[PDB]
Design an enzyme around this catalytic site. Structure first.
Site, PDB file in Angstrom:
ATOM      1  CB  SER B  96      -0.900  -0.015   1.024  1.00  0.00           C
ATOM      2  OG  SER B  96      -1.437   1.229   1.655  1.00  0.00           O
ATOM      3  CG  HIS B 121      -3.755  -1.451  -2.473  1.00  0.00           C
ATOM      4  ND1 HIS B 121      -4.904  -0.996  -1.775  1.00  0.00           N
ATOM      5  CD2 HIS B 121      -2.921  -2.256  -1.517  1.00  0.00           C
ATOM      6  CE1 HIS B 121      -4.525  -0.860  -0.385  1.00  0.00           C
ATOM      7  NE2 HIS B 121      -3.480  -1.446  -0.306  1.00  0.00           N
TER       8      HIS B 121
HETATM    9  C1  LIG Z   1      -2.621   2.857  -1.088  1.00  0.00           C
HETATM   10  C2  LIG Z   1      -2.178   3.935  -0.116  1.00  0.00           C
HETATM   11  C3  LIG Z   1      -2.356   5.325  -0.987  1.00  0.00           C
HETATM   12  C4  LIG Z   1      -2.672   3.675   1.123  1.00  0.00           C
HETATM   13  C5  LIG Z   1      -3.614   2.658   1.309  1.00  0.00           C
HETATM   14  N1  LIG Z   1      -4.721   2.878   2.087  1.00  0.00           N
HETATM   15  C6  LIG Z   1      -5.199   4.107   1.806  1.00  0.00           C
HETATM   16  O1  LIG Z   1      -5.375   4.893   0.824  1.00  0.00           O
HETATM   17  C7  LIG Z   1      -5.560   4.616   3.192  1.00  0.00           C
HETATM   18  C8  LIG Z   1      -6.344   3.595   3.945  1.00  0.00           C
HETATM   19  C9  LIG Z   1      -6.824   4.057   5.479  1.00  0.00           C
HETATM   20  C10 LIG Z   1      -5.726   3.685   6.264  1.00  0.00           C
HETATM   21  C11 LIG Z   1      -5.952   3.988   7.783  1.00  0.00           C
HETATM   22  C12 LIG Z   1      -7.027   4.743   8.274  1.00  0.00           C
HETATM   23  C13 LIG Z   1      -7.914   4.947   6.969  1.00  0.00           C
HETATM   24  C14 LIG Z   1      -7.884   4.650   5.838  1.00  0.00           C
HETATM   25  N2  LIG Z   1      -6.340   5.710   2.905  1.00  0.00           N
HETATM   26  C15 LIG Z   1      -6.347   6.946   3.920  1.00  0.00           C
HETATM   27  O2  LIG Z   1      -5.495   6.964   4.698  1.00  0.00           O
HETATM   28  C16 LIG Z   1      -7.733   7.715   3.855  1.00  0.00           C
HETATM   29  C17 LIG Z   1      -7.893   8.488   5.116  1.00  0.00           C
HETATM   30  N3  LIG Z   1      -8.935   9.615   5.190  1.00  0.00           N
HETATM   31  C18 LIG Z   1      -9.818   9.194   4.077  1.00  0.00           C
HETATM   32  C19 LIG Z   1      -9.734   8.474   3.068  1.00  0.00           C
HETATM   33  N4  LIG Z   1      -8.526   7.865   2.588  1.00  0.00           N
HETATM   34  B1  LIG Z   1      -2.904   1.402   2.215  1.00  0.00           B
HETATM   35  O3  LIG Z   1      -2.661   1.691   3.567  1.00  0.00           O
HETATM   36  O4  LIG Z   1      -3.600  -0.053   2.047  1.00  0.00           O
END
Ligand SMILES: CC(C)C[C@H](NC(=O)[C@H](Cc1ccccc1)NC(=O)c1cnccn1)B(O)O
Ligand SMILES: Nc1ncnc2c1ncn2[C@@H]1O[C@H](COP(=O)(O)OP(=O)(O)OP(=O)(O)O)[C@@H](O)[C@H]1O
Ligand SMILES: Nc1ncnc2c1ncn2[C@@H]1O[C@H](COP(=O)(O)OP(=O)(O)OP(=O)(O)O)[C@@H](O)[C@H]1O
Ligand SMILES: CC(C)C[C@H](NC(=O)[C@H](Cc1ccccc1)NC(=O)c1cnccn1)B(O)O
Lengths: 338, 196, 340, 196
Positions: B96, B121
């Site tokens: 990620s 992803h």
């Molecule tokens: C792919 C990269 C950009 C990051 C991946 N996931 C995300 O995009 C993360 C997943 C996540 C992690 C912790 C808390 C909440 C959400 N997205 C975010 O940080 C996030 C936060 N606020 C609104 C929308 N997305 B990874 O952590 O799987």
């Protein structure tokens, strides 16, 4: 006479290599000292001015020629000279040396004539090691030297006139006695770098990867009282010696380092020689030795240690220290007699 | 368990981890999930190591499941900011957000150990963001801005088109170390250097 | 009659620039000293006068010794420059506090009845302060009998006390004791009471370039400094030497009798070369002397720094004038007015 | 995990964590949520750094998701009170109270990072506050006091009308750094300074 500062420096060049700003300082200030004598002892206007000395604070790393530039300066003065350490000095009281025994060293250097000793130069070595953060040998020596560094009618506590049991004190006016003081001030280049260097951090501020920009607030942050720095208006700024100066310190001065090793091998009847690449290789390993020109000796004592052992047990006439003998320990060429 | 002594010297309660030893040799360690507290730690270390020597390369070790996007772009920007080049080394996984930081090293200086995986992803929302449809249209324009920003970040560090990052990060794209070299996440699958 | 305090002042103004409060004091106090010695001949007088000793406070290099060295030059009264660091409590090595009376008796040419009407300047009494501490607080213990007035047995040996000898009996109930000291850690102690906090909401935090004038000082601040409460009450007069501003330091360069610019013009005249300054240069020298922060001694630290490439080159050449400008103060060079 | 290094300063052998080192270079770090316990910390650091030197700029790093309004205005008032100019840098997100603290920096000295996120929105009650309708009339006039005060605050610092702040913070107005520069939350996107 009054030898000019170019003439004083030309004498200092014969022994001290490098150190341009410190030689120009200690030639100008000795010349101003020679001029404020015979202006306070002759008198003329206009508006007849009582001159006042400008004491010298020398600052630079070890081996870089602070004491040696004063010992060189000692060999040319028309005035009395007294070398002294501050590490033996204490404040008036406690068991160590009093700050008027440095005046006794000047009275003794003037053949017990006070009118010549009032015109003298005292070299207080190691004033970085009377530094503070009570302390009676490293806080109170500032407090006791400061009356001496400005001028006072001091009286030396032992030996007034070859020890008569009445009047063991003789007076001395330290108003016209120039003081050159010195020390490494080893932690001070980390203090100066906080101001002129600006080691910044973070987003925005500039990030960056020594004794010539010395303000009194750095010497207070080093730990020296603010009264003591004002008596020392002149900063001599002794510099760190590079490779190109340490090559010359081996061979150029009068009592040069390789000159006093070829003297040692001439007592064995052996002509010691150096290739010029060997003198560079000695000075390559002396700037890494980190003790100035005192580390040039530390290389040449271990380059010549297997040589100085077997050569006085042999019959030879010429010994050549090549550059291969210095970078690693190498065998001896030893030109046999012929 | 982590072996670590406390030297005191009557000046401190001075701690000595192996992480303190790594940080002395300019190795920042991303071994946890990229959240705010991790990103806060990593950015503080990147700015300290820029100030200590901005010329020597910071090394960033990455063994991380990846986390929040703004915590990602916090670390990402502080990586890209500092004057030091960043050697990213992948340990085990960079998933990620941590694969984006792995690609965010200086080109030629992005490493992975041979059995490390690189999991890229698209961004997600962990859990459900409730709200009115006007709130959700904002939160979905946000997750598309996060998706587009992650793809254009991986575009400028892998040399791929950002639309190629779209079609590849549609699902989990797990790369090996050698597959991440061909993809452009890392530049060197790091060879073993054992004596025997 | 017996020079007025305005007349003592205008002698001090010929040497000392600034410190108007510490020149009214030491003109008043020397005139009150003269009136007390004038009352030392009687007719009818049912009231006797006391010393009113002076504790003179000020930062480094701003003129406390130089006020006393100037006050030496007019005094009609014997004058000893003592130093409190040279002194040590009785029974211990170093000098004892009866040496400062001997320095007054030597200044009175061993006329004791003239030395009983004397003035002693004890320099640096901030350095006697806070296990016995024979050179600090013990000096203040030994010195308070001297300040308030006692029949002090002074050894004529030279100053080192030793129990057997004939002594010199001196009475210090009319000897004025100007004492001085830098008191370098005292402006923080004064600020704890007269000022606001150095931190927080509703506080007064200060810049690093801005000393209190030492004029709000009280013995509450001086006991916390390290002076014993007995030593301070025997010093009723507070003389406040102030930190010299730019306007005072441009005058200390050029205006007094042995002024600093006058010293260097004398030095270059012995090379046969006329030294002179633009007025913008003297303001630039006094600018950098506040940055040194050592008073008028920081002026000399620049005049030697500005004229170091000059004083090397000038004695080896033939010049007639030198013209030192602001550019020769902020950038080290030399550019004379090369002789036709 | 946070590795701790050693600084050979005027003293040397001084153990320091990167957060003490930020604070030594007058960088206050807001990386956690703005609650009372965080606001208590930042206000204590703002007053210490004002006392150490009131002329040197305090830098405030903002990686916060934002939080309580009174904790916001506690930090806000202390940033505005101190004699030192505040240099706010956004690192990752500045959401809710944090974007107000990001705009609260000294004009000319408000920065973000190129992928930083600035999220402004109106105040919200976290969870249901219950009570009689006279209690709820107080609590609703209070969140309108909080909403107006936030918009009055963002009007002073962005140069926009408070009614324009009110229309923009109807929903979550997410700005990028270039969008927050044009909005007036920051005025420097802070280009990267890596030597390569
Ligand atoms: C792919 C990269 C950009 C990051 C991946 N996931 C995300 O995009 C993360 C997943 C996540 C992690 C912790 C808390 C909440 C959400 N997205 C975010 O940080 C996030 C936060 N606020 C609104 C929308 N997305 B990874 O952590 O799987
Ligand atoms: N500039 C120089 N030119 C020639 N010889 C030098 C120079 N500097 C040092 N030396 C040699 O090094 C030796 C030590 O010199 P000196 O006593 O000046 O060191 P120092 O810096 O005073 O030492 P420290 O600072 O540790 O007291 C002397 O014997 C001298 O021969
Ligand atoms: N107000 C002034 N006017 C003219 N010259 C001054 C003045 N103040 C100081 N100076 C010059 O500064 C030099 C040092 O002055 P002084 O001997 O009084 O030092 P000081 O500040 O009392 O030191 P300390 O405070 O440590 O006792 C003197 O030579 C004097 O010429
Ligand atoms: C937009 C700015 C002003 C702040 C945002 N929200 C608020 O205004 C915050 C949200 C919040 C956070 C923690 C606990 C309770 C409530 N409002 C308050 O702090 C609050 C507190 N008491 C009464 C009313 N509102 B942020 O936290 O999303």
């Amino acid at each position: 006479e009054l030898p000019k500062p170019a003439e004083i420096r030309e004498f200092l060049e014969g022994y001290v290599i490098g150190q341009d700003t410190a030689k120009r300082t200690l030639a100008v200030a000795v010349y101003n000292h020679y001029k404020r004598i015979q202006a306070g002892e002759k008198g003329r206007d206009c508006e007849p001015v009582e001159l006042t000395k400008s004491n010298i604070l020398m600052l630079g790393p070890t081996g870089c020629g602070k004491t040696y530039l004063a010992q060189t300066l000692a060999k040319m003065l028309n005035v009395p000279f007294a070398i002294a350490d501050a590490t033996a000095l204490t404040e008036a009281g406690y068991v160590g040396e009093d700050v008027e025994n440095i005046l006794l060293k000047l009275i003794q250097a003037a053949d017990y004539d006070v009118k010549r000793a009032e015109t003298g130069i005292i070299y207080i070595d190691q004033v970085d090691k009377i530094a503070r953060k009570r302390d009676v040998s490293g806080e109170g020596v500032q407090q006791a030297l400061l009356k001496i560094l400005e001028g006072t009618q001091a009286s030396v506590p032992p030996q007034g006139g070859r020890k008569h049991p009445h009047q063991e004190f003789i007076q001395i006016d330290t108003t016209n006695v120039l003081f050159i003081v010195a020390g490494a001030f080893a932690g001070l280049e980390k203090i100066i770098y906080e101001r002129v260097g600006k080691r910044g951090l973070g987003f925005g501020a500039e990030v960056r990867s020594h004794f010539a920009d010395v303000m009194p607030e750095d010497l207070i942050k080093f730990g020296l009282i603010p009264e003591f720095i004002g008596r020392l208006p002149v900063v001599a700024s002794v510099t760190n010696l590079d490779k190109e100066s340490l090559v010359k310190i081996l061979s150029e001065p009068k009592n040069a380092l390789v000159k006093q090793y070829i003297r040692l091998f001439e007592m064995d009847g052996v002509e010691l020689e150096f290739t010029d690449d060997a003198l560079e290789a000695i000075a390559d390993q002396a700037i890494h030795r980190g003790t100035g020109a005192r580390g040039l000796r530390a290389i040449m004592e271990e380059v010549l240690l297997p040589v100085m052992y077997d050569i006085p047990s042999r019959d030879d006439v010429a010994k050549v220290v090549v550059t291969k003998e210095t970078v690693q320990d190498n065998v001896l060429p030893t030109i046999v007699p012929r | 368990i982590l072996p670590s002594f406390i030297e005191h010297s009557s000046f401190g309660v001075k701690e000595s981890n192996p992480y303190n030893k790594l940080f002395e040799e300019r190795i920042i360690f991303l071994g946890v999930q990229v959240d705010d507290a991790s990103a806060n730690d990593i950015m503080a270390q990147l700015l300290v190591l820029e100030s200590l020597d901005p010329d020597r390369d910071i090394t960033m070790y990455i063994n991380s499941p990846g986390g929040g996007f703004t915590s990602l772009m916090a670390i990402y920007d502080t990586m890209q900011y500092v004057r030091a080049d960043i050697q990213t080394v992948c340990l085990g996984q960079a998933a990620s957000a941590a694969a984006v930081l792995l690609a965010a090293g200086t080109p030629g200086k992005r490493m992975a150990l041979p059995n490390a995986r690189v999991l890229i992803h698209q961004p997600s929302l962990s859990g459900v963001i409730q709200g009115q449809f006007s709130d959700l249209e904002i939160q979905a324009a946000e997750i598309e801005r996060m998706r587009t920003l992650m793809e254009t970040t991986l575009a400028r560090h892998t040399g791929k088109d950002a639309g190629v990052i779209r079609k590849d990060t549609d699902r989990d794209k797990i790369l090996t170390a050698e597959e991440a070299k061909d993809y452009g996440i890392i530049d060197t699958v790091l060879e073993y250097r054992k004596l025997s």
